[PDB]
């Protein structure tokens, strides 16, 4: 993934646990060589997955909790590190934002030519609920999506109830979530 993602993970961990713990994780992940992540540079997805695993070990938390934390963190990080206006342009409510998300990533992709973005499709089941279809070229990022949805819930001061109803990994087509919001 692009360096920006790895910087965001480093930032979250540093801000929450200290540069010492971060350095420990970085070392364990096998990334001691890398002096710093270059935000607009493409990296192997391996870097990101290794960071998360190593962090799960050092911190003694399941990796899923780390993807969730990171998903939540991302909503704030992007808004503060150069993508606040983009985020705003995607709307002022959860359902509208989720409808705009493919278009938001298309806009990101204008600048990150090698982007492999997620795809999100909403099937609205009422004015306060939807079924969200998440399609990805990558494995294991459902928990990150859960965190991101909570982050957007905070962004929009909206209560978000999310349950995963289908799983990419256990041989279903793609991840699906049922969501209620108020």
Binding residue positions for heme b: 2, 74, 105, 116, 134, 136, 138
Which CB atom, from 23 or from 108, has the smaller least distance to ligand HEM?
108
Among 100, 118, 124, 180, binds ligand HEM (CB under 6 A): 118
The residue assigned the tokens 């646990």 is 17
- Strand order across the 129-135 sheet: 119-126, 129-135, 175-181, 160-166
3-class DSSP state of 45: helix
Dist CA 151 CA 90 (whole Å): 15
Cα–Cα–Cα angle for 40, 50, 32, nearest 5°? 75
Two structure tokens written together for 176 = 């699906």
Q: Is 137 in the site for ligand HEM (CB under 6 A)?
A: yes
Among 55, 68, 145, 146, binds ligand HEM (CB under 6 A): 145
Dist CA 112 CA 59 (whole Å): 32
Q: Is 63 in the site for ligand HEM (CB under 6 A)?
A: no
Q: Is 156 in the site for ligand HEM (CB under 6 A)?
A: no
Q: Is 176 in the site for ligand HEM (CB under 6 A)?
A: no
Q: By CB under 6 A, what part of segment 89-108 binds ligand HEM? A: 105, 108
Longest dimension (CA), the chain: 51
Which CB atom, from 1 or from 66, has the smaller least distance to ligand HEM?
1
Residues forming contacts to ligand HEM in the complex (CB under 6 A) are: 1-2, 4-5, 75, 78, 83, 86-87, 105, 108, 112, 115-118, 136-138, 141, 144-145, 148, 152
């Amino acid at each position: 993934m692009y360096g920006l993602v790895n910087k965001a993970i480093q930032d979250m961990i540093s801000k929450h646990h200290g540069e010492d713990t971060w350095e420990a994780i970085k070392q364990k992940a096998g990334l001691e060589d890398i002096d710093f992540f270059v935000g607009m540079e493409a990296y192997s997805d391996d870097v990101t997955y290794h960071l998360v695993g190593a962090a799960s070990e050092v911190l003694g938390k399941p990796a899923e909790e780390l993807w969730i934390a990171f998903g939540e963190y991302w909503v704030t990080y992007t808004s503060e590190e150069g993508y606040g206006e983009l985020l705003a342009s995607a709307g002022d409510s959860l359902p509208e934002f989720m409808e705009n998300l493919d278009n938001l990533h298309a806009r990101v992709g204008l600048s990150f030519p090698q982007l492999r973005p997620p795809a999100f499709e909403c099937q609205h089941t009422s004015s306060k609920s939807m079924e969200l279809h998440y399609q990805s070229t990558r494995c294991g990022l459902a928990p990150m999506v859960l965190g991101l949805l909570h982050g957007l819930g905070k962004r929009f001061q909206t209560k978000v109830e999310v349950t995963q109803t289908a799983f990419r990994e256990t041989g279903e087509d793609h991840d699906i979530f049922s969501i209620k919001y108020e």
